Amino acid sequence: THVQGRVYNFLERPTGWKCFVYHFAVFLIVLVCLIFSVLSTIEQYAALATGTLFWMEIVLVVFFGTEYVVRLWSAGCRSKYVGLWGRLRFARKPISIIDLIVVVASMVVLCVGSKATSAIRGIRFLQILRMLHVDRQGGTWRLLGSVVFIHRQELITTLYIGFLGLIFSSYFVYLAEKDAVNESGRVEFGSYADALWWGVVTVTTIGYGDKVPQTWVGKTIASCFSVFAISFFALPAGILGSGFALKVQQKQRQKHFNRQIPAAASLIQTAWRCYAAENPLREHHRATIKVIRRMQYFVAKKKFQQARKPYDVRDVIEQYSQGHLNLMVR
Amino acid sequence: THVQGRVYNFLERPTGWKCFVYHFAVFLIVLVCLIFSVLSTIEQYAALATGTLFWMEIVLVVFFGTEYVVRLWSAGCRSKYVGLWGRLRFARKPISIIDLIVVVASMVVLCVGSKATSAIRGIRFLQILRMLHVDRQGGTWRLLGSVVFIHRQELITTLYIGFLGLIFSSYFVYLAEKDAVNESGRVEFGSYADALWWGVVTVTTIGYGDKVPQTWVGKTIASCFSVFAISFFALPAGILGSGFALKVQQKQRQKHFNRQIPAAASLIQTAWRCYAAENPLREHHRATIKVIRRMQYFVAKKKFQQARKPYDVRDVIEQYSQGHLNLMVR
Amino acid sequence: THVQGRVYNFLERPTGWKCFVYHFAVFLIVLVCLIFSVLSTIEQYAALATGTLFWMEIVLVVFFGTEYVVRLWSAGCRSKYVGLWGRLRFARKPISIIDLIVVVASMVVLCVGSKATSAIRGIRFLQILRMLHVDRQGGTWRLLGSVVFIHRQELITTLYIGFLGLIFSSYFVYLAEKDAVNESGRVEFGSYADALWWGVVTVTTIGYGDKVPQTWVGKTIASCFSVFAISFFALPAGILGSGFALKVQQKQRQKHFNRQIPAAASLIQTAWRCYAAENPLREHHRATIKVIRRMQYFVAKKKFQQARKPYDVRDVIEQYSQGHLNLMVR
Amino acid sequence: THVQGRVYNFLERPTGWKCFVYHFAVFLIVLVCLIFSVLSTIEQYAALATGTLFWMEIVLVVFFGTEYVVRLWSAGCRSKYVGLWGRLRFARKPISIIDLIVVVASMVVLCVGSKATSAIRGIRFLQILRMLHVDRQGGTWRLLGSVVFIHRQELITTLYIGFLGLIFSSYFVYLAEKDAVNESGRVEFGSYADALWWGVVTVTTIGYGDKVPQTWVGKTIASCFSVFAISFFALPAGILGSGFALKVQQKQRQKHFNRQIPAAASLIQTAWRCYAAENPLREHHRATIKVIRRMQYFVAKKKFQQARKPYDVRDVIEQYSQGHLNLMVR
Amino acid sequence: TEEQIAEFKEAFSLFDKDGDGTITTKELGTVMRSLGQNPTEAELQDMINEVDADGNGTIDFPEFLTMMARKMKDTDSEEEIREAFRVFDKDGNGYISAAELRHVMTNLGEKLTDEEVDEMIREADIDGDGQVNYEEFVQMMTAK
Amino acid sequence: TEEQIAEFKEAFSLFDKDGDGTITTKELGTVMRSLGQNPTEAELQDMINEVDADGNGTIDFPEFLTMMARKMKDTDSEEEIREAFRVFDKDGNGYISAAELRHVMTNLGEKLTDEEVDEMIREADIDGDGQVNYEEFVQMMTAK
Amino acid sequence: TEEQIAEFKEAFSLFDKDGDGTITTKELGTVMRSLGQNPTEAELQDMINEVDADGNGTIDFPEFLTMMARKMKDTDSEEEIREAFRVFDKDGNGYISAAELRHVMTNLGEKLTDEEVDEMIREADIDGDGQVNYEEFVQMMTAK
Amino acid sequence: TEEQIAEFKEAFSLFDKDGDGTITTKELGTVMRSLGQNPTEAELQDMINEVDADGNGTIDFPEFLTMMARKMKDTDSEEEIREAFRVFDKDGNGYISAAELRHVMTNLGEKLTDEEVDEMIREADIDGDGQVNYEEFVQMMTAK
Numbered sequence A, B, C, D: 001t002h003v004q005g006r007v008y009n010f011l012e013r014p015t016g017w018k019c020f021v022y023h024f025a026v027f028l029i030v031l032v033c034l035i036f037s038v039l040s041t042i043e044q045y046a047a048l049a050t051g052t053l054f055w056m057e058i059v060l061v062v063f064f065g066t067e068y069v070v071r072l073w074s075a076g077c078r079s080k081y082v083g084l085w086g087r088l089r090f091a092r093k094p095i096s097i098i099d100l101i102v103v104v105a106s107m108v109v110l111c112v113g114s115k116a117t118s119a120i121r122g123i124r125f126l127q128i129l130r131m132l133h134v135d136r137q138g139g140t141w142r143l144l145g146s147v148v149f150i151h152r153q154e155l156i157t158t159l160y161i162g163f164l165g166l167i168f169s170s171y172f173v174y175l176a177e178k179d180a181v182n183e184s185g186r187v188e189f190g191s192y193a194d195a196l197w198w199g200v201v202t203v204t205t206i207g208y209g210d211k212v213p214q215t216w217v218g219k220t221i222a223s224c225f226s227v228f229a230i231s232f233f234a235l236p237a238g239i240l241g242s243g244f245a246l247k248v249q250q251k252q253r254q255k256h257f258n259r260q261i262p263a264a265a266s267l268i269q270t271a272w273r274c275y276a277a278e279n280p281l282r283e284h285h286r287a288t289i290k291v292i293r294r295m296q297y298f299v300a301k302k303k304f305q306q307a308r309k310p311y312d313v314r315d316v317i318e319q320y321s322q323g324h325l326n327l328m329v330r
Numbered sequence E, F, G, H: 001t002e003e004q005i006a007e008f009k010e011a012f013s014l015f016d017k018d019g020d021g022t023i024t025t026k027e028l029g030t031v032m033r034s035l036g037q038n039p040t041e042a043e044l045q046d047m048i049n050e051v052d053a054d055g056n057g058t059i060d061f062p063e064f065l066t067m068m069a070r071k072m073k074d075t076d077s078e079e080e081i082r083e084a085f086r087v088f089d090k091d092g093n094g095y096i097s098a099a100e101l102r103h104v105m106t107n108l109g110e111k112l113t114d115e116e117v118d119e120m121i122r123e124a125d126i127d128g129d130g131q132v133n134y135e136e137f138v139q140m141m142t143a144k
């Protein structure tokens, strides 16, 4: 039963090229099933589509059902989840419960609906809700949430400020434009809600053009605003980008050291052996075991040394600070 | 009268979860009262709203009046403000005077207005002006102002340059498009003011579409401009974001050391004691006081050491530079 | 004739608050004269404006003429420009020649034009061209040019790439949309030039809306493009911002050391004195001169030390690297 | 045959001012030929253009044919490509094969087409496809690809997230706006595809304005979306910019050391000589060779020292860490 | 050393108010409250979460003999304590005056009795100047 | 030294199962598989991609005499090996207990026989405390 | 030392033009203006804002005896002064010539009398080369 | 030293082809071109833009006696030259073999005569191994 964890990490901790194209393929399947949900809403094509979305749906539901059950069985390799109670502790997690309700509700709809409005009205949301199924472990969302929580203060700040700017400048605009009538005879700014829509659309640099001011006062304010407030709805981008990058680097750094350890262990685990070459043609077996012990040691030494090199600046300074300390003893 | 400062920092230096949800709740109250000021300007709903905004207004005014008076009383814990003169030195500050005029002018309007146009015309601005009441101490604005003052030069620079680009390119456009007539028969560029509106709307990436050039010259210029000037209205974002982040980090750093001190003090404040275990069943009381002195010392030592670790790189280098110096003595 | 350089740096190397508000005031004058050039192009107001722009113009021209002549005279404090040949080397510089042609051409127009179309048609461009007069020395433009030249490669790169993306995607769009006819009966994409206008307006996030595609192919391409190319017209912002900031910091750093030197000099210039207290009631004059020498020395020592502190990390490491070296001698 | 590599690096590894303006000139030629392909699609001017684009085309094709053949011949200086097999290994590369098919297909079209629709329909794409010919070696694209591959994770992340936001918010909008009818009588949101177009146009800050929601629900969602998702389509800019900059710096650094080496070599290559001044008027020839050996040595020493200075911080710390180590021996 | 390894064990269980080999962590809070301390429960718990290397809560001097078996005077505790002054270092030199030193000893962390702080620096202000040299105090406490 | 430079060459070609001056890289994988190792081919190849400075695959002790001619005890291999403990340094002091040390020697990289790990630290836990001083082990291995 | 602790106090109050124990900060500006200095008021104030550790403005040599009680020759003032040359260090070696040294001593901060600068380096240019070794000048000033 | 300070001045003006105290910078390019060098004019100019501390172009050994008056063997030129190998340091140890060393001495900067490079390392490859210890070469050149 070595296969258990094998397929597990083939499914749940994927790495390589095989499992990769597997996940990729299933993703593409999902995406085309969606793009048929798309062409379903178009009357020109709402017939053939809603048809093949009754076969393709069943294909996918059974596919996923099996992939799920097999995943669940192969969740024993991880002791935390071994045994029925652990197993339940598994499906307790978000992505799993999502896949569950997807699959079972597809089964529901296709157990009653097949004998068509509510059906498709739900099927679309399922085809949409499934995309979650690819990011099998959530590193994406965790990256995000961390970066935010870190920078929570900056973000709140700029949000508060932009919000206020919006509010005030929009009120003033409303006051300045509420009478005015478009050349098409109508009125754009009847209320503060409309002005506030304007503000949103404006301060974030979309500018549909459905609401534009006519008066010199309104244009004046809108100009000043447009110049001095848009920036508070465009910081988050730079912030978050820098955060992402930094964090990835931080991580792969840490990974460097997690690589560092095993070699440190193996070095000595080989040294004690080659050194301890006297107490594990029997004598020739002994000679050869000694020779290989020696060789391996010679190998480790180099591999350790190469895996102890200064990833960065802090590393060097720690090292040589420590040498200085060693002198502080001497 | 320990409660005085207790409620004070419950109101004015909040931290935790209780005072948090307090401030949060009052914020939500404010926000819905606003969103009814919103639906007040809509004739469909301008009746019920303006009604309940006569009860909810009184609720809030009295709420705030008491919160204010109690805050003021509880401003004695801080000596700077103790005594009538200090108290006056309190209400002298911006956010307090804002809350004051809010509350009293609500009282005014509701003392005369109740016996309806000017009333609501002012009430809206109050409901808007109140949002200031949440940021109880202004860290938001101070962050902002500092970051600016720091980067004043960059900002002025890009402003000046963008301004000029605007000016010149708009004049040229005016020259190139002043005759032209829209296909709807009208003329978009009659003056330089209109061109200048175009420029604003353009260089900052809004593009309503109410003013667009027709001639090959105008399109040429607008293209070059649109490519080579928009960037000077989008730097501030990156700048300010980086500034915010940096400053927050700088601060929490400093905070690390402000944490560092107390432990340094307590360590010795315990050492002298345990050491000085001879000059503060009386003898058993003495034995036990000695034992606890010793234990505490053992505790401090570790806590200090852990609270003296290298937050960052500058710290390590200072430390070991200093060790080197100590050698410079030796 | 100490006043010469005095007024010079009051005019040409300004610093403080007086000269500041001077330059500021003249700036505001310029700006309002412009904003009347604005309201000149509006027929409602083209009468009074063009009038007062005949008095205000003369005011400014004479003002500037004198400010210029006096500046020129006060350009002797700087030896490089002393003597007629140097003086000529002065007006040879850009901002000066600009002010010159401004003033003289105002004089021209007002020497012939007063005895009205061509006149105002030129006056507007002068009122516009004058704004250069404030940045008296050009640090703005130099900052810019440096930052660019540094980052020339990145910028060229993103420009080339965005250009190509534009080209290709626009051609494809043209092919896909050239037949199509707007619901208003007309055709937006008749040529490649129109498509290319679309592209410009699109990839840089303006989106007027005057040209939009109708076909599934065009929308497909425009989507992909809009997602994967806009970023190459928005990098320059982040780049340039970071550059600006960095450079300012670099400069003020350097300034730290330029401050560092004088103190280093004065320290010793006082040490040799106090030390050399024997070879410059005469004896009491001697005693007092000695005492003040000593005091001053005690002052320098501290001021130097405080002005030799580690602005940054590189400074500390240089210092203590150097201590290590000093050991390398020992 | 020293000229071989001479013209080669004049063509393929250009540096200086001559080869520069060469490449620049040919670029401008290409660009105007394009801008006539532009004015070809305009019926006002589709006659003269398509004419001169029959002469200019032949000019360019022959120009390029020769430049190509000569380049190919001059590709021997590089041994890797010497000999027919190497030569073939040359044209195997992308930019070369591109130039090849450009030139030969121009020849095709002008060998059959001259005896006009398909012709010009292809010629336009050639005039477009040629621009590749300038970046003679591809540093542009390589910079790009590297920076990406580095930051692949961040980018994928933000893409996935923005994609989802798009999907969901657009579905909800569709549900909220599918009935609504524009004031012009028509319906904007008939399908999910239209909503999805809206989303694309919106979340990336274009906002044509061809599709706008009317209902309070739609505006609500669009607002929240517009605020909280646009940022995931604007990170890439900051990321990529920082990447570019960093990489360029990294490179020129490395270049510093690649400069460092030759001097290290020459120093000793001169030292051994001047030192070895006894075993290479013959004696006066010997004296003079000795003198020049000495002088050169004195030159190197300084040049090396100046070319070993600390580009940056890591350099200093490595150096003095190493001095410390040298002590670790002592 | 063998002259205290025995009379120390008697006080060792003196916290349990019985003969069990139990430090009596829950009862040390009453031992001290009777001594006149009356600490909190978190401080009571942290007192032993590290003072007792075992980890139980009541111990047979696995570390209750080690804590006593730590001279608290060697070089390993002469620098950690010297750094604390360096927190209060400014322009160096062990400059501290009785002024700032009294300012601080009586304001931060675990303050002293005014008579404790007054006569604490007394032995360290022998010269009577405003520079309480640290080397003057550690040498006094080097026997800790 | 001259007493082993000869009997060592005999075992030198003992891997080739013949008299060729060949380390027999492809056949060392069978030599060890018969010894009871049975390694993989990548490990077999890396064993000699650096152990043999020549670079061929079968060598006349260009380095097969150099690897033996490396005492593996000098100062050049006493710090590289001391740093590995420093990976497991935390609060310093060569604190490591038999507990963490056994935890680790039997879990990572190339683990030992439980009897190998148990008696390996035995010589390094002479005092019986939970601090296996590294200086106590290298001095034991300094003759490596 | 006891031979100057007395005749120094007489000059101590010589600034007040009276017998008050007052440094006469406001009157030192006239004392020097009569000596031939005529400084500004900010310089007059900074002269004592740190020279007098008391902080009043007129003092009974709390520091007016300490400033005199600072040899101004020990190692604590031999490096701070040696760093100033290092500002003018370039290629090291105490290379400074009489050329740059005169260039500087007479242009920056508090310049000398041309006769002061000419004969100041005279004692430091004994070898007559363009390298005024700093170690040659501090040893001359080490008695400061 | 006094035995060469005279016969050296004769060769000093030997570049001017006359008795003027002129290094003959424009004529050294012909002196060497006749020696068999034939350098460029920029190299000719840089040869003296720093070798001659004066700055004229023809000098009366202000530095033409200083360049000779620089032993070129002291510690100030033993580290600057040792760092160049450290450029070629990799895994340290002065590992360089005759292989890489010949690879380099004959490919970069100012290459030697194959007979110069072959016998140059000859004295530094006494042991015949592929590790030309730098300390073996500087000691050979320490008399430079």
Ligand SMILES: COc1ccc(-c2csc(NC(=O)[C@H]3CCCCN3S(=O)(=O)c3ccc(C)cc3)n2)cc1
Pocket (backbone or CB within 6 Å): A161, A162, A164, A165, A166, A168, A169, A224, A225, A227, A228, A229, A230, A231, A232, B144, B148, B155, B156, B158, B159, B162, B232, B233, B236
């Ligand atoms: C092109 O060169 C530029 C462009 C912009 C800047 C820049 C720095 S700080 C800044 N805005 C701001 O600091 C804020 C606050 C001051 C007014 C302008 N905005 S507000 O509209 O959001 C706004 C408006 C009204 C209320 C009640 C709250 C918030 N604008 C600097 C240089």
Ligand SMILES: COc1ccc(-c2csc(NC(=O)[C@H]3CCCCN3S(=O)(=O)c3ccc(C)cc3)n2)cc1
Pocket (backbone or CB within 6 Å): B161, B162, B164, B165, B166, B168, B169, B224, B225, B227, B228, B229, B230, B231, B232, C144, C148, C155, C156, C158, C159, C162, C232, C233, C236
């Ligand atoms: C997509 O790749 C790009 C895109 C842009 C750049 C880039 C660097 S610097 C820059 N503009 C500029 O440096 C300024 C100044 C030079 C002209 C263009 N702009 S101006 O219109 O504001 C402008 C126009 C007219 C006047 C009187 C003042 C200011 N544009 C580099 C790469």
Ligand SMILES: COc1ccc(-c2csc(NC(=O)[C@H]3CCCCN3S(=O)(=O)c3ccc(C)cc3)n2)cc1
Pocket (backbone or CB within 6 Å): C161, C162, C164, C165, C166, C168, C169, C224, C225, C227, C228, C229, C230, C231, C232, D144, D148, D155, D156, D158, D159, D162, D232, D233, D236
């Ligand atoms: C929201 O998440 C995102 C969004 C965008 C990116 C990203 C990285 S690199 C990149 N584009 C690019 O690298 C370039 C080149 C590849 C195609 C897309 N663009 S092209 O259209 O200008 C373009 C198109 C056609 C031609 C002939 C030249 C240039 N796009 C990554 C993540």
Ligand SMILES: COc1ccc(-c2csc(NC(=O)[C@H]3CCCCN3S(=O)(=O)c3ccc(C)cc3)n2)cc1
Pocket (backbone or CB within 6 Å): A144, A148, A155, A156, A158, A159, A162, A232, A233, A236, D161, D162, D164, D165, D166, D168, D169, D224, D225, D227, D228, D229, D230, D231, D232
């Ligand atoms: C002006 O001040 C601001 C503005 C924005 C932010 C900020 C930080 S994180 C963030 N969005 C986000 O984190 C994502 C995820 C949470 C909802 C909002 N967006 S989502 O719409 O793309 C989106 C929507 C729906 C689905 C299914 C996926 C993705 N928005 C912070 C401060």
Ligand SMILES: [K+]
Pocket (backbone or CB within 6 Å): A205, A206, A207, B205, B206, B207, C205, C206, C207, D205, D206, D207
């Ligand atoms: K837009």
Ligand SMILES: [K+]
Pocket (backbone or CB within 6 Å): A204, A205, A206, B204, B205, B206, C204, C205, C206, D204, D205, D206
């Ligand atoms: K935009």
Ligand SMILES: [K+]
Pocket (backbone or CB within 6 Å): A207, A208, A209, B207, B208, B209, C207, C208, C209, D207, D208, D209
């Ligand atoms: K629009």
Ligand SMILES: [K+]
Pocket (backbone or CB within 6 Å): A205, A206, A207, A208, B205, B206, B207, B208, C205, C206, C207, C208, D205, D206, D207, D208
């Ligand atoms: K728009």
